[PDB]
Ligand binder design. Structure first.
Ligand SMILES: NC(=O)c1ccc[n+]([C@@H]2O[C@H](COP(=O)([O-])OP(=O)(O)OC[C@H]3O[C@@H](n4cnc5c(N)ncnc54)[C@H](O)[C@@H]3O)[C@@H](O)[C@H]2O)c1
Ligand SMILES: NC(=O)c1ccc[n+]([C@@H]2O[C@H](COP(=O)([O-])OP(=O)(O)OC[C@H]3O[C@@H](n4cnc5c(N)ncnc54)[C@H](O)[C@@H]3O)[C@@H](O)[C@H]2O)c1
Ligand SMILES: NC(=O)c1ccc[n+]([C@@H]2O[C@H](COP(=O)([O-])OP(=O)(O)OC[C@H]3O[C@@H](n4cnc5c(N)ncnc54)[C@H](O)[C@@H]3O)[C@@H](O)[C@H]2O)c1
Ligand SMILES: NC(=O)c1ccc[n+]([C@@H]2O[C@H](COP(=O)([O-])OP(=O)(O)OC[C@H]3O[C@@H](n4cnc5c(N)ncnc54)[C@H](O)[C@@H]3O)[C@@H](O)[C@H]2O)c1
Ligand SMILES: Nc1ncnc2c1ncn2[C@@H]1O[C@H](CO)[C@@H](O)[C@H]1O
Ligand SMILES: [Hg+2]
Ligand SMILES: [Hg+2]
Ligand SMILES: [Hg+2]
Ligand SMILES: [Hg+2]
Ligand SMILES: [Hg+2]
Ligand SMILES: [Hg+2]
Ligand SMILES: [Hg+2]
Ligand SMILES: [Hg+2]
Ligand SMILES: [Hg+2]
Ligand SMILES: [Hg+2]
Lengths: 461, 460, 461, 461
């Protein structure tokens, strides 16, 4: 008689379970942790609030946490990112999950509240696993009594880590966090290769456009921008890159991309006159990758080539000024998470109008909104880090420390390099890769253990 | 002017024509030349320099001199000098001791001619090093000169490793700047420089088709990443070896098969541990590690007939060339190309089929068989070298009280703001246009509109 | 009260129409023909039996034939290739179409029969548009009388053209044909670049597998093999290629692939001992591209690495020995067109068994079965050629010619190079591409017209 | 006392011989022919006039002809293409060769005449091996009596075949020819992948310029322009392509290039105003690949970005208007085959002038002029076809045919596909590739012999 969940359709569970059984075979780092630690039950007593895209990959993460002893209550961190078969399979396993594809904002907030509250009162949570910081913010603003008994936060993504550091700087962070994003087996695997796999995927599923021979503009060349640029260049797009960071721009030039600004001399006045209309009038596809605000602005949207695709793969939809488009232009749904936005005006359009843009996932993360996000074998790295981070903070028991002892551990830290390497090794073995073992003489020559770690903490890979 | 030794001074006019082209390819370095000419920030600097005597190094040397410095220069490798570059520098009245094809004895004699002027220690007060050989000779043989030296700026991964070892052991006597770990060095030169120059060197030495053939790249650090791409972009089927599982994961995701020369990755020192089936299919092996003996005698015995062997790490002992010199007959094809006949030491059949081709006698192949990295890439490295010389010279460490010294005795990198300023001049060189953050966006991500744009933790 | 159709769900018509309007914007060659010829109605009196994948792209073709004066009756040429929203939109425009995704063989045969018959009697067809030759063969074997009134066949694909050339050599071909496949703007566009876009697309939709770092074997390196190999390599697969043709093998080597045989020394002795078990045990993905029979045989399937994906992008499913798999192994449906094939035997599978292969689209064309086939901007070339071919053979009126005139025109021919060039020019202008105009001096220098054709008939591009 | 040669430096022979011995190991098709035919001496009595770039590769070809029984007299077909060590090694083997790197035009013509004449009178030539048609033209215009006793011409390159086809159409061709260029193992090997190898090679040797991140324009997208574009794109250049052939242009778009014209709307109006000065002012590198005249004209050269590199890889230097630059601008030699062309005027220049172009090889084929041309393993295919073509025409003995029989055989033909396949098979084996053998059932299914040929003559690969 399990009823503590809300999903689109519980009858999708058998399909979900079939896809989780496949995903386990694609996630050797995560299933290596499930096997190594099952006997010790390192998360026995852990009560984890989780807010991360309710995908098949997240299903394998949740079932690993539970297999190691945890109880969880789960929600998705985006209105369009749930895979309803994954949510159904987790609910069918007796796990509280509140998530469906195509939530309203009001439904999204309700789902997070259903994880925080059990039977109308605060759950006895003692751990947080977050992607983006929405759940972390809600606890700090609305449930400070709950944070007293929470040992830590493990945060998936660049934007969430930024939010945590902002809190730590202001003295408002209440519990220590692990920056899961900045493991190399997360940042330089998931953020880059995941977007390489999933950006072109999402654009094909939404539009079935040919990409070969068409013009793209990628805004940003961080980890997401580098993967996104490759996703499109490998398909034969002519890609131009925009950046504010000249080091990232230098990489884009060396990687074979032209570096351009939407604005004349890179100076945005706020005026239409500052827009490079000739440049934007040639672009078939714009992708935002920044974690910043209004990097695809109203004046750019007005200047884009007719019938251009617009999408965002950064964490939050405000990278694109979709509010401007909702206020001024007519939205025609092609199919779910695909809109033609008619620049002829707000009330009504001609069905054969040529002056439209195609917006994917209403500006929300397009890989998860229009496809299935990153593949299992990539999310293996991110989620093996999540499990190690949950074990570490749970074992430290911050909530039970005296005040003077809390003050010494209240930090946002990354996992040790040795753990990042042990995750990587399982990922390499999963490809059938064979790492060389250093001879004792070689290990002495370069000043490392045969076991590693192999690099200094300053190393950038 | 006679205070120099080069292959042929008559090559000076050609070297000057190529320096004028290189200046047009090096906007970051020429931007510094123009920004700081007025102030003469290196007036009174006396720089001992030991780095590959190429056209690119010529532009560095003339930048230092234009900013007020005096220099004395040698190459840090027996095969890396461009004789036209060394001639142009000598013709400009700068002391330089370098030629392509030095013996080891000539190599040591060149470094000693920088250290000594007219038979006595030069009054040197700055060091610019690539690989640590000059640093090491000053510490072991000329410790007194180090009492008047304000610091060392070190170019390469291997040299920085040697500096950090000295610092660990308390033997380092002057502070150093790790130039290698600017992003506009490590993630520019080490990677993209090898992408440009490895296939260049192979083609000039052998003129072999690369497309369709099998390569093994040992290492997947910055040099191994660039080397793998140099080969893959030509259509090679590239396999990668690594001891670092994170670097191996990157190779797998970059589309390479990750393999070991040894069964299960375990080198037990015996022939039985060699994966003979794997090595018997390899047409090209490239070492990129900065480690010792990563292409060993048993690997060399197992390689496919007529495989090419080369090293692009700093030192020749990545490959066991000593083994080949002791066991096998060397046939010079042309300078820096040898066929190594596996049939015996004291002769070979001119038509023997059982040989390897060794490039640059196992020394850095890009510089030995071609011209190393291109100007527009070395612009990043060398703009960092100039900023690093200006910083340590302005700090005047040799002139500080003992207590002040002990606090400044470190191996540091340049600040990120300077790395970003070098990158911006490189981007403008390509006609790239960086976007300016709005005040609202700068507030939103918590940075200055001017930068720096990233925390020190950021890996790019 | 139109009712002369059978589709999955007429209510999908509005969605189909939205996608057709987008597809028109992606198909400048085909809509250039619709606009150039509308006034002249060159297919006035044409009654076309068509049997080509009922996709959005085929809808733009159909509505082009109709806009130039044709009547059509339409079936799909594959049980899984129909897009139900495309079939619905065509049914809704009052065109007879018999097609849905997931037909049985019996339902496939029934749909072809509904195009051939109108009200229980042979339709007064006078033109055939075919893909693969099945409708051509049915007319020749079962409705020979109908071929007396038919002016010609236009055939889309390599396999269909092979079958026509066989009929012509045996004297069994009754009407003239145009080989549409061998326009350069078909064979060197669709067959190659279409499979580049759509093979990785279909594998991602079916499995969501990471491709980067995994081992593929592509059987064949013709136009489909070339595009398929690029589809996988550009995602970071380690691709090996098999071939029987040493010229195509040479091209694969030069393109940077290792050329291997599933068989020791390339010799299939029919025994397990001739299988290269070491090679096949490292393969994560096998793709058949040959148009030949049993190129992924039972012994190969037994030797494949556990959890390998198996698929076919050739015209017919017998490239893979799926009959062996149905007889011997247990099929578990993951979701439509995705089956795990448990190598543990016939009489039950374990949900958690690790010893299975994944078969896509039951061995049928994977790009059309698991995704949407080639994109509109590629099918533009193929379908502009189809329209030109239909116009040409309909204008020649073979059925109306005296016997001695017929004998001189009974051929399998390609379209003239000038029309291939004019299709190409419209495709290039669709990218914003600008061709140079030869000066008269340069035209004279190379022996051509400023207007083209630019190349001799021998030219291979 | 052999003296019947002229080379730069006979002391380079031992170096040339060392490189020939390495080249033999890289040319398995050509050394397979040497082994197959040495016993039968099929070129016993052949007296071959040869005019083809005097490289190491050409050396292996010459020594193969000689090993099969031929005598030759040799010249280079370009003033800058000779490798002096190769010429020295051939002279040291007692073979008449007249060739050095850096000939004047007068020396070039003299070398060809030294092959034609032995001891001041016509040599008893009976075969011709040409690359570009210059020897063929001289024999037709100046030595018709020598053509009476010649059995055939074997022509290497696209430009030479065009010249033969013009002579055949005008009835002026006096002996039959084999078009070697249009073997697939020539045109789709040498012309494409040779230039892929050798273009970037020559640019790096001449300039040592970084190519990554810079802007290129390739004029033409036939076999040489396809290879050239890839040489540059694989280095990270941003490549734009010009074409007059829309089918070639459609290939460029689909391959991921922007297709542009040096002229506004592609139309040369006779004036500077029709030059797209905005486009050319961004180009760092222009490469001509056309076999046409003045495709990089004076007005394009005036508009190019300061410090741009200019080069040609088509057969003749007149692709670029170098006569304009010689008449109007000051040439500064950087080093051999590298000139800075100062656009500030003819008389002199400032050493630090910024307003110059860098011209490679004085506009002569840049791969051979600034590097070593194509590699041995590619030239293997071309030169195996040359040997087969020499055997074929020498065996046919056209010179000895009566007039009525000559008229039936006077043709420009390609080698049969079976021989092109046999060359490709030796090249594939050279890579370690393994071709699959068709089973009898598969051979019947696709209508071919198990031995091949595998494709119809219409097939384009
Ligand atoms: N969709 C996914 O699956 C996914 C995966 C990982 C991360 N993310 C999210 O993607 C975003 C980017 O993450 P990341 O790891 O690449 O961050 P990052 O810091 O590595 O890169 C962002 C880049 O944006 C650039 N930028 C900022 N403002 C700009 C502007 N106005 N114009 C141009 N460039 C500008 C920065 O200079 C920086 O290099 C974050 O919101 C992150 O949480 C999404
Ligand atoms: N030729 C050039 O122009 C050039 C340019 C830059 C640096 N360098 C030199 O190249 C070398 C490498 O520099 P880097 O910056 O790439 O260093 P790095 O530390 O980034 O990379 C070296 C890699 O070698 C790997 N490795 C070590 N031992 C190994 C073994 N036994 N088998 C397999 N892999 C092994 C390490 O795991 C590491 O990832 C250094 O010697 C450096 O000074 C040369
Ligand atoms: N799925 C699609 O959208 C699509 C697109 C175009 C064509 N097609 C179909 O794809 C198939 C191939 O078409 P194509 O145009 O590439 O034909 P093709 O003749 O160009 O190539 C087929 C290749 O298969 C090779 N081959 C044959 N038997 C082989 C074997 N046993 N092992 C290895 N290689 C073998 C041949 O040598 C040949 O090079 C045909 O059935 C055609 O109708 C499908
Ligand atoms: N350097 C080498 O080693 C090498 C190798 C092979 C061939 N070649 C020579 O290269 C040249 C090209 O040979 P190919 O086999 O590529 O010929 P091709 O006929 O395949 O291609 C030449 C292309 O140039 C295009 N073209 C002609 N005029 C043009 C113009 N004004 N603007 C743009 N495009 C234009 C044509 O449309 C055609 O596609 C010939 O001279 C040939 O002899 C040189
Ligand atoms: N399939 C997936 N399942 C769960 N989270 C994912 C998936 N694809 C991408 N993400 C995550 O989305 C985050 C952005 O909210 C990224 O940091 C990444 O770790
Ligand atoms: Hg979340
Ligand atoms: Hg999120
Ligand atoms: Hg750039
Ligand atoms: Hg040095
Ligand atoms: Hg060095
Ligand atoms: Hg791997
Ligand atoms: Hg069909
Ligand atoms: Hg079909
Ligand atoms: Hg010639
Ligand atoms: Hg020639």
């Amino acid at each position: 008689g399990f009823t503590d969940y809300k999903v689109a359709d519980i009858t999708l569970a058998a399909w979900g379970r079939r896809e989780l059984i496949i995903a386990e075979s694609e996630m050797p780092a995560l299933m290596g942790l499930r096997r190594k630690y099952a006997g010790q039950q390192p998360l026995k007593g852990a009560k984890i609030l989780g807010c991360i895209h309710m995908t098949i990959q997240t299903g394998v993460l949740i079932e690993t946490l539970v297999a190691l002893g945890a109880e969880v209550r789960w929600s998705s961190c985006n209105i369009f990112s749930t895979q309803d078969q994954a949510a159904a399979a987790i609910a069918a396993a007796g796990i509280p999950v509140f998530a469906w594809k195509g939530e309203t904002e009001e439904e999204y907030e309700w789902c997070i509240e259903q994880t925080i509250l059990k039977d109308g009162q605060p759950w006895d949570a003692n751990m947080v696993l977050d992607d983006g910081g929405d759940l972390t913010e809600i606890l700090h603003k609305k449930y400070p009594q709950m944070l007293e008994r929470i040992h830590g936060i493990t945060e998936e993504t660049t934007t969430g880590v930024h939010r945590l550091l902002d809190m730590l700087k202001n003295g408002t962070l209440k519990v220590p966090a692990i920056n899961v994003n900045d493991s190399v087996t997360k940042s330089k695997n998931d953020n880059k290769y995941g977007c390489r796999h999933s950006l072109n995927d999402a654009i094909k599923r939404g539009t079935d456009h040919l990409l070969s021979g068409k013009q793209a503009l990628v805004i940003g060349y961080g980890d997401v921008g580098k993967g996104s640029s490759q996703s499109l260049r490998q398909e034969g797009m002519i890609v131009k890159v925009a950046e504010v960071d000249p080091i990232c721009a230098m990489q884009a030039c060396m990687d074979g991309f032209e570096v351009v600004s939407p604005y004349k001399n890179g100076i945005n006045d706020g005026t239409e006159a500052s827009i490079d209309a000739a440049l934007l009038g040639k672009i078939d596809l714009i992708v935002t990758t920044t974690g910043n605000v209004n990097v695809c602005d109203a004046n750019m949207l007005k200047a884009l080539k007719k019938r251009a695709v617009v999408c965002n793969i950064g964490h939050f939809d405000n990278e694109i000024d979709t509010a401007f488009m909702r206020k001024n232009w007519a939205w025609e749904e092609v199919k779910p998470q695909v809109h033609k936005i008619h620049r002829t005006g707000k009330d009504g359009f001609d069905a054969h109008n040529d002056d439209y843009l195609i917006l994917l996932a209403e500006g929300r993360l397009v890989n998860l909104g229009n496809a299935t996000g990153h593949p299992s074998r990539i999310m293996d790295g991110s989620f093996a880090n999540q499990v190690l981070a949950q074990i570490h903070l749970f074992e430290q028991k911050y909530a039970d420390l005296p005040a003077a002892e809390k003050a010494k551990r209240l930090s946002v830290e990354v996992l040790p390099k040795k753990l990042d390497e042990e995750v990587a090794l399982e990922m390499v073995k999963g490809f059938g890769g064979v790492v060389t073992q250093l001879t004792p003489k070689q290990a002495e020559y370069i000043g490392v253990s045969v076991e590693g770690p192999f690099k200094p903490d300053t190393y950038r890979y």
